[PDB]
Design a protein around this ligand. Structure first.
Ligand SMILES: [Mg+2]
Length: 173
RNA sequence: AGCCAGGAUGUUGGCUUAGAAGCAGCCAUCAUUUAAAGAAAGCGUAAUAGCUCACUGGUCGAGUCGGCCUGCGCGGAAGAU
């Protein structure tokens, strides 16, 4: 578990050479008012600043909860340090949040989607496969607190489903 | 009606924004020092800044303002021997 945590934390370090240098560059050339006179430049700096800002708030957890863990977590987990081991649960959560953030933020990523499922060759077998696939996606939606709206469903003759087109809506679908 | 002066403070109201400081918007449209000063009507900017305006004090020293009813006119109004 500890090892896993460490591994997770290493990713966060992975974005230390990005944040510092970038920040420095931004303050050095972009922050300036005579650079600012061009809107595009300003916009660029703002984008650049965004990168910096992400790195600031979320790295603290990685550093602050790592360094404070070892002194109290070493020998005792059950007695007196039952808070102190599940104190690192908070850290884990933070890490997860960071990772998830990294994953998302990209174009159109919040707006819900409408996946069509199309079968392949095999004919009868294939339709069953399609159905199975559909089922899995439905269950995923169910799992993740989504609401699925069933639009197209088309049965195949010998068995299964030929064509389906399923639209789910909610939080970063 | 010109003319001379002010045209402030909390305050750059917060935000979301890239930034937003009356003036991109979205929204609240309040209170201060009071003669009076819009969380701002226009220009202006990255945006501030800056330049006007509202209202208000002075100067001057008689009429003035924009509706209503009706009279007669103007524009709108270009064609082929
Ligand atoms: Mg006529």
């Amino acid at each position: 578990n500890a090892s896993r945590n460490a591994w997770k934390a290493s990713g966060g370090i992975f974005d230390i050479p990005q944040k510092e240098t970038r920040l420095k560059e931004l303050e050095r050339r972009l922050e300036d008012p005579s650079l600012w006179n061009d809107p595009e430049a300003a916009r660029k700096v703002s984008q650049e600043a965004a990168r910096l800002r992400r790195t600031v708030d979320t790295f603290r957890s990685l550093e602050s909860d790592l360094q404070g863990l070892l002194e109290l977590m070493e020998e005792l987990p059950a007695e007196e340090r039952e808070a102190l081991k599940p104190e690192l649960e908070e850290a884990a959560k933070k890490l997860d949040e960071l990772y998830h953030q990294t994953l998302l933020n990209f174009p159109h990523a919040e707006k819900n989607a409408i996946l069509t499922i199309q079968p392949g060759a095999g004919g009868t077998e294939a339709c069953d496969w399609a159905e199975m696939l559909l089922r899995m996606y439905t269950r995923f939606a169910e799992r993740q607190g989504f609401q699925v709206e069933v639009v197209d469903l088309t049965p195949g003759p010998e068995a299964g489903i030929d064509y389906a087109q399923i639209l789910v809506k909610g939080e970063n679908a």
